[PDB]
Structures are given as C-alpha cells and as structure tokens.
Amino acid sequence: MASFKLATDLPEWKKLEETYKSVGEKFSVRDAFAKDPKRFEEFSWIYKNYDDSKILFDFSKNLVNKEILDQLVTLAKEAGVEKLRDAMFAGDHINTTEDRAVYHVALRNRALRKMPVDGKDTAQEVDDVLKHMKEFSDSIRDGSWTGYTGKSITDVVNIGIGGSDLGPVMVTEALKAYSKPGLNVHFISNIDGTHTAETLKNLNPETTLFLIASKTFTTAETITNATSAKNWFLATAKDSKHIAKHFAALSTNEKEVVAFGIDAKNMFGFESWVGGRYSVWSAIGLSVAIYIGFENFNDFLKGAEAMDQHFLTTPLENNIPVIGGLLSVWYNNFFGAQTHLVVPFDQYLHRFPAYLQQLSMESNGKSVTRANVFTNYQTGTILFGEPATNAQHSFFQLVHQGTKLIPADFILAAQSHNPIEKNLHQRMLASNFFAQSEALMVGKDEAKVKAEGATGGLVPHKEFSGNRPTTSILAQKITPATLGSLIAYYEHLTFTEGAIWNINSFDQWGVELGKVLAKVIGKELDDKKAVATHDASTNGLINQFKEWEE
Amino acid sequence: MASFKLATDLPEWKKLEETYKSVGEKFSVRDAFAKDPKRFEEFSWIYKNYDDSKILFDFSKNLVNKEILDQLVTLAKEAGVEKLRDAMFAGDHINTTEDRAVYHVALRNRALRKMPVDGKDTAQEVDDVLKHMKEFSDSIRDGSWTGYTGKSITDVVNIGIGGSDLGPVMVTEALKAYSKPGLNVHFISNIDGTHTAETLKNLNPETTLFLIASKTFTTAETITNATSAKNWFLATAKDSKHIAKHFAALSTNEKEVVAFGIDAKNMFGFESWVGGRYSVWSAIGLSVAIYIGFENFNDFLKGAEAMDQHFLTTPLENNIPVIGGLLSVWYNNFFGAQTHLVVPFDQYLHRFPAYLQQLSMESNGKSVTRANVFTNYQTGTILFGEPATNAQHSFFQLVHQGTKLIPADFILAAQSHNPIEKNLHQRMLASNFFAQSEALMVGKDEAKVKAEGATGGLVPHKEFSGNRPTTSILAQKITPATLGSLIAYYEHLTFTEGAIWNINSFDQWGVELGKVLAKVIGKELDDKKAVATHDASTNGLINQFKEWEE
Numbered sequence A, B: 001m002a003s004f005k006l007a008t009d010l011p012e013w014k015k016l017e018e019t020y021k022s023v024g025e026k027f028s029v030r031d032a033f034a035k036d037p038k039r040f041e042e043f044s045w046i047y048k049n050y051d052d053s054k055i056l057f058d059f060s061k062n063l064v065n066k067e068i069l070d071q072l073v074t075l076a077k078e079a080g081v082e083k084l085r086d087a088m089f090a091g092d093h094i095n096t097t098e099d100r101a102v103y104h105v106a107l108r109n110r111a112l113r114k115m116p117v118d119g120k121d122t123a124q125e126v127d128d129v130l131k132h133m134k135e136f137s138d139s140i141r142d143g144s145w146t147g148y149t150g151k152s153i154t155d156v157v158n159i160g161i162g163g164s165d166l167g168p169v170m171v172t173e174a175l176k177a178y179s180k181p182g183l184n185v186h187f188i189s190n191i192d193g194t195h196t197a198e199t200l201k202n203l204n205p206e207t208t209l210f211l212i213a214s215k216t217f218t219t220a221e222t223i224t225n226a227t228s229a230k231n232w233f234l235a236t237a238k239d240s241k242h243i244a245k246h247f248a249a250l251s252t253n254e255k256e257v258v259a260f261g262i263d264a265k266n267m268f269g270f271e272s273w274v275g276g277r278y279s280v281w282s283a284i285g286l287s288v289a290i291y292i293g294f295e296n297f298n299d300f301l302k303g304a305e306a307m308d309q310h311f312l313t314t315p316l317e318n319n320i321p322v323i324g325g326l327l328s329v330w331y332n333n334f335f336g337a338q339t340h341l342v343v344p345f346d347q348y349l350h351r352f353p354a355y356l357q358q359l360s361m362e363s364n365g366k367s368v369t370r371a372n373v374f375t376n377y378q379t380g381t382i383l384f385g386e387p388a389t390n391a392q393h394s395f396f397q398l399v400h401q402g403t404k405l406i407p408a409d410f411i412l413a414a415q416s417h418n419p420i421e422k423n424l425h426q427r428m429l430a431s432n433f434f435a436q437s438e439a440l441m442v443g444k445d446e447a448k449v450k451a452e453g454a455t456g457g458l459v460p461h462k463e464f465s466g467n468r469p470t471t472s473i474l475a476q477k478i479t480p481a482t483l484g485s486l487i488a489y490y491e492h493l494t495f496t497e498g499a500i501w502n503i504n505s506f507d508q509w510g511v512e513l514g515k516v517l518a519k520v521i522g523k524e525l526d527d528k529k530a531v532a533t534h535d536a537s538t539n540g541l542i543n544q545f546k547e548w549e550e
C-alpha cells in the first residue's frame, strides 16, 4: 500500500511551485555559470563501471541550481523513492495491479547475490538459463549446431513484437561492431505480411534459425508470424521432424511452446516478473548472445548490474539516475514541457531513442496512482529522438528556435569502433556534440545578429534565445558494458519519475487491451458484407475497406 | 509584406478561445455521433488521384464539429491562407528571410503548366533535368552504364544529409516493392565514421555508383563523406579518370561540383527555390528513380501534382490538407497538445514518421512572424511515430492511458504488396487499424471495468477515458502515386499551419547555424591541450574528451 495518494500531497511539491515562479521560469544558465565558478564540477558526475571504464554525466546546462536540486531531492525523500526502490530489489510485488514482483535487476545478478521472489532466491534459476544461452549460442557460433541438411547456421531470425523485439533490435544494432562476418541477425515483428516476406526472401531454410520470442507465447502477431515462418521452413524442409534444429523459443509458457511444436530442450525460460520493456537482459536477449557472443552479452549484463548497484547504494543527491529523473519531473510538471529528446551522436545507437521511447512511455503513461485514485497532474513525458549529426539538419531547427521547451540528452563516445582516417570523422562528430549543447545554452542575441550583418526586419529571425537545456553524457567507448549501464540508467530514471508521480511504472493495461481489441473486427473481415455494429466512423472505414480490399 | 502581425490579432482567434472553453475542452466524440447521424459523411473526404485511385481521409473521430470547423475555416480566411498559397504557386519570393521563391510544386509540374520564377517559366528547365534523370537511371538499370572494369552497376550509394538524405531513404523504403533483385540502394549521411565503414564494407568499387547529394555542395559532413568514398574507390581503382563512371552529383552549385572532381555531364541540377525538406521531387530523388525506375518516380511526382491541384482549387471547407492543418492548430493552440503522432499501419512506411518529423518541425519550429515580431503563442508541434502494429505494444500505452492529449494520424492501405497466406496477415493488420481508433474514441468506463471482473482499487487502473482523437487515412494501395499524394498532403498541411501562425515555413536559421558552429571546436580538437575558451561545461566536456580519446 501507498504512503501518500498524489504527488501534489507531498509538501515539497508546492514549495517547488513557488521556486519555479521565483527562480525557475526565468532561469539563466549563463548567469548560473557566472555566479558559480564550480558549477560544472557540482552538476556533473563520473560513473565508474565494474570494468573501471567511465561515463561522464554532465547536467550543468540544465535549468537547475543548488536550491532547486536540493528541493527536488527533498521531494524524492517525501515520495519514498528509496523505500520503493529497496522493495523492488527485495523482490516485493510492487507491480500492484498484476500482483507481480519487478525483478529485471535479478536478470543481471552475475555476482549471484541472494535475490528472492516469494522468499526463494532467484540467482541459480537465472544463472541456469544464462548457462543454457551460453551453451546454445556457442554452438551456433562455432558451427557445431547444424541444420537439417548438416550445414552451419548463417542467419538467425527473431520473431516477436514490442518488448520481445525492440531490445534485440536496438542492442544488436548498437553492438554490431562486435559481430562476425557470415553470422547475421534479422527480425520479424509486424503482423504486416511485408515484414515476413521481405525478411525471408533471400534466406535459406537449411541455414536459418528462428527464435520465437514471446513472454506469453499467445500474442496474435507473434504466433501468426511464427506459423508463417514454420510454413516457409516446411515448404523446403518438408518433414516436421526437422523443426527441432531450426526453431527455439524464448518464453515463460512451456505448455504453449510445446503445443506449438517446439522442443522443450529448445526453450529458454524466464519469469512473470520480467516486464517486456525490461526483458532484453533475459532469455529474450538470446539473439544478442548469438550475434556478438555470450561473453559480450554477459559484459552487457554486468554493466547493468554495476548501474543497479550505483542506484541502490548512492545517496539521492549524488545518485545519477535519480538526478536525471528529478530533472524530468521539474521540466514535465513545473515548466510544462511535454517531451524529452534523446540524441545519440552515434550511428550504431540509431534505434536507442525508439527503445527508450518504449521503456519510458509504456512505463509512465499512466493516470492512476498506487493509492488507486486518478492523478491531477502530468505523468509520463513523450520521448523521441534520432541520431546526430542528422538530427541537427532537421528537427533541431525547432529545438533551437521554436516555442516549445524540449529537454534533451546528448550521448557521445570518446572512442569510435570505426576510427577511419586517423579519427578525422570522429573529431568532427565530437565537435558537433560540444558545439550544439553550447549553442542551445548561449543563444545569439539581437546585438550579435546585427554585428553579424543583419538589418531591419531580418534581425529577429536570426536570434536564438539560449537557455535551452541539455544533458551531455560522454562515454569512453560504447562497449557492451557501457551500453548495459546506459540502459540501466534510463531504467532507473524511469523508476524515479514513476515513484514521484506515485504511479505503477510496471503494468500496461493499454497494451494489454490492444491485444484483445482486434479479434471482433477480424471476424467481421471474413466476408464482404457491410457492417453496422460500431460507431459510424468505424463502420464507414470497415465498409470502405471491404469495397477496396482484394 | 504581411497583412497582419500575430495570429492572436485575427478576430476569430479569440472567438475560438471562447468556443474552446464552452464546447471544445470537454468535447464528447461519442455524443457528437449520437447527435449527428451523418457525422462520418460530413467529416470524411474521398480524395481522387490523377490515376482514378482513391484515398479516404476520415477526420470524424477528432474533437471537432460544424461550429468548430466553420470557425477554423474563418480563421484561415482571416489569415490569408489562400493569398499566401496562391503567391507560392505564382513563384513569389514568399521565403522572405532568404528572398527566395518556394517552388517544390514546380518540380512535379508534369502537366507543363506555366510556373514562373522571376517572370521566367520553370517548366522546361525542370523537365530537362527529369529527362536527364530518366536517361541516366534507365542506363544504370539496363546495364548499359558500366563501371571502370566494364561491369554493370549493382549498388547505388547516396551520400548526403538532412533534406539530401531522408527523402531518398524514406521513399526507397516505402516503394521497395517496386525495386528489382540485384540493384540495391544504400545511404551514407552521418559524419560518424561508422556510417561510411559499415555501408562500404561489403561493396565492390567496380560495381558501385555514388550520388553526392548536396544543394550547396559545401556541407561539411557530405563533402567529408564524399571524400572518404572517393578514397575508398581509388584504393581499388587507382586512377582518377575512373571517377567519371562512378560519381554523380545532385546539386545547385556546378562550380563546387566540378572543383570536387565530378564531371558536369554527371551533374543533376536544381534551383535555390527547392528547400531540402521539400527536395525529394527534384534531382535529389535520383536514387529513387534508379531503384524503382523513372516511370514509377514520375507517377510519384504526378501524385504530388494531383494533390497540389486539390490544394490550389478547392474551397477551404472541403480542402483536405487545409482541414488537417486547421485541426493541428486547434489542438496545438487551444488544447495545448504539444505533439502530433503519425502511425503507418505499413512496414514499408517505417521511415515515414521520421521524414514528416523533418518536414513539419523544421518548417514550423519558428518564433518570428512575417511581420518580423516575436510570437506570443505556440507554433510548430513535435511530430513523432513508429509503425503499427509494433507501436500498439509500446508507447500506445501512454496514448491510451496517459495524461497528454496526442492527436494521431493512422494510415492503412486496403491492399498489400505482400498479400501472403491469401491476405491472412493483411486482414489482421487492418482489424488493428480499425479497432485502435475505435478504442481511443470509445474508452472503457468504470461500470464496464467492473462488469469485466475488476473490484476495489484495481478498477481505475483499467479504465480508459475515450475521446482521444484520431484521423484515419485509408488508401487503396501504397503505389508511387499514392505516396506522392500523401507527402504532398503533409506538405500543404504544414503550409496551412505556418500561414495561420504567420511564420515563414521555408527558412531554417537554426540548421543554418548548426552548419557553422562546429568549426571552432573542431580546430581545438587538433591537439590534447586543455581548453578554457568556452563556458565551464563546454570546457569540461572537451577536456574530458581529450583525456579519453584514442
């Protein structure tokens, strides 16, 4: 049960409202640096990973100072962020609406700490699945696992959707430098038949392995796609006895896996307390272990584990994911900014914003608190992004000169996996990282526009307000361990937001509804008869579709 | 000059604020359908393309009725949307801050109407470039254009960024069903050296053609990338005389093209009045013509041309892109919704939201009007999206149950290019399209949650408010012509927004700034000496980078 009903019941909330009016709304970052020669030192933190690599989190270009941050920390104390966090790590059923533990942190428990659910340690059970993943992925990679004609596997196709898709997509893209020629990964997720047809068109059934990724193993899109892949395989392989060399399952539901025709020996299990958007650390990450090797996957887990330990053991005022979450609340609930931009200065990380968009919005897009009352304030932000430098040429126009405050996170690795031309491209990339956050802060006033040659009516069009906030995250290199720590940072930032708003960050009743909505209309699409069973728009759309379909 | 200073000066603006308070804020779409048996007919429009194919635009699930729409149309009349539109089509220099015409509509003038800039018809100049594009792309596709060892071209690499990249990416993806096996397109855009290394890793210099896409032909990323591609080519080909068979340019700057070493015969030109985010219709679309054939590219242009004629000749109250733009203003400026979601129920269109994000946000992310005064109201929205059905499993949670109004456009084709399993996947895809917009409108109230079995505190967590607006766009098929009309719809929706806000939708002084910001810091990264020439954050980030770089 909750210790308070609404975030607005916390006494510091109205104090933050007063501080916003007096100090926050018109905050000058330029003035803040001028007033405080140690501002960069005070509002940046170096995170040290388990492997002694480092990530610099620089929050000093945000609309924040000592007073504001101190009050946000007080708000986090009043909200019981630490109590709820400790309950999560203790295995308590803090997913109240589904009565489930929330234990993705147990998936990366490589230290084998005691981490119990329902009073029973999970460490060995998690480790045993990882050992199965290591054995299987090693056998795919070294060629000892062969297809039905005796050939080594060359292509691995993950079939799944949502949390069973986007992690595998984003992480294999992000860590692609660690892959090897001749062993490729592909993804089928959309029910749109295009996804099946285009992905399989050049693949060989003899050398293709399918992973059917589904927590429930009942999702309509995934089972339908999996059946289509089975039909494609059997069109060449003919006999269903060959399925055991080409189909594995990543799931919690052994009975449904076996009923689908997959061998239980080829099932990689996980538990109900793994949320889909928190699941790439589990068996769902098997495509990652195959693509880059289990040891790299394990280093990825250990990076998450190190960030978990930072989040668990650090006082709030120096707790990096807490600080990021507090700033999000500040912008969302006091400035009224509805969005959060994440920009990787890194092409491999091109799907990182989409992954965070699921993690963040599906967790915190809620309107009811843990006291089971409706909110009277804003909850989850709309998260979006694209990689830089491309984004600088497109929607950065609005970030710089529009009418909306868009808090932004910029991410750069100091070292490239592809340092071509003795790092000529990498130095250019880096210079854009520094210069863009600098310009968003400093702006360009009327006098400077005039000095640069504009006169008359042109002048205001070329001005920049400045005081547009950024967070800069500088890693040494995007290794598996670094990426593990970066995802976990956003996981625990998301945790902090939800704890302050007092929402359940771990259910998703809108996604659960979506998975049962379509069946009724699907049955109506089995013929060409006009329908009148819905509202007039739904009827009109269905009936126009029936006139235009094949 | 401008006929008014600020949108809030238009008399209908304050009338719309009164209407918002009295009927808009608490608008019930359910009640609207119950009140009006003809609502679907009244708020849906069938667009007929030049080839007699059709697209249904259904706006009837929006928070709009006859009263509201009539007032928005009155606002558009007061704002002179029609006058500014007619000036655009007349070739007038409505891009006031750069003193340029805005004439992407002239690029798709396949009818060869008189369309003059500076009093000189552009029709034949545009047509001549298209003839060159047809001749060249035909020769690549039929194999008569051979590489320096006499082999036909198998791979075409577009090198460009922003407007010189995202159109080619999005459109070749969207129309991929029209490509041919053995002729593939690739894209290098990011300055990040990863993009060059990964794209070229498996390509053969003897069978690869490069298109250097750059309006100015001076952009830092593009020229640096083009030089790297030239170095890659010459590492195998050795002799620079061989560049003339492997490098072409898409540009307005012949002098810079020739100085780079590309022959003028291999230049495909366009004019200053083509904005990058409106440029895929020009020479910049050459990769599209090569990938799917010039005739398909021409049908794509003719679909845009037909939507141009709809926009130009239709009274405002039935003008489809105007209606979409008026609804955007209604949500942005009266409800205060900061975002606009676009969801293609179509895997080929997976990059369509990213393309629209550039088109929309770079056009309308402005704070100064055509009267050269600062706005006191919201301008450009934040546009985002991912394909369905994937999005239904992720951030649709927030769309359904969060605290933010997110106006959404759903797009579906009635016929698939990949109708596998006798359209089994396609019927499922379609049922999700209908059911999601239905559910966002109808919601699920307390009584229904209780009837479905929830009790006590669980009940509010499973409720859905409904009255969450959607626009449904149902095409017959995503053909080249249909895609042309769809992009042009969003171009002219974007036009309508900017005309009401009285901003210049056609400059981009923030992305122009970005292209000059990085050079100063780039010079500082030539050594490892600590820097103190910036604010303390920029200094600290640079100095930490110097310590951590290779």
Ligand SMILES: O=C(O)[C@@H](O)[C@H](O)[C@H](O)COP(=O)(O)O
Pocket (backbone or CB within 6 Å): A160, A161, A162, A163, A164, A213, A214, A215, A216, A217, A218, A219, A222, A275, A276, A277, A362, A508, A511, A515, B393, B394
């Ligand atoms: O976040 C979620 O819960 C969803 O995106 C699920 O991951 C998606 O619906 C797939 O569910 P399952 O893994 O049970 O097939």
Ligand SMILES: O=C(O)[C@@H](O)[C@H](O)[C@H](O)COP(=O)(O)O
Pocket (backbone or CB within 6 Å): A393, A394, B160, B161, B162, B163, B164, B213, B214, B215, B216, B217, B218, B219, B222, B275, B276, B277, B362, B508, B511, B515
């Ligand atoms: O929208 C824009 O103007 C930018 O995205 C440009 O397209 C980008 O900067 C590339 O410019 P250019 O085509 O001159 O190389």
Ligand SMILES: Oc1cccc2nccnc12
Pocket (backbone or CB within 6 Å): A196, A197, A200, A228, A229, A231, A232, B420, B421
């Ligand atoms: O039924 C199918 C299953 C898999 C792939 C396919 N590709 C083209 C056509 N049908 C297909």
Ligand SMILES: Oc1cccc2nccnc12
Pocket (backbone or CB within 6 Å): A420, A421, B196, B197, B200, B228, B229, B231, B232
């Ligand atoms: O300098 C280069 C140019 C192009 C491709 C490259 N790939 C790897 C390493 N260097 C490269």
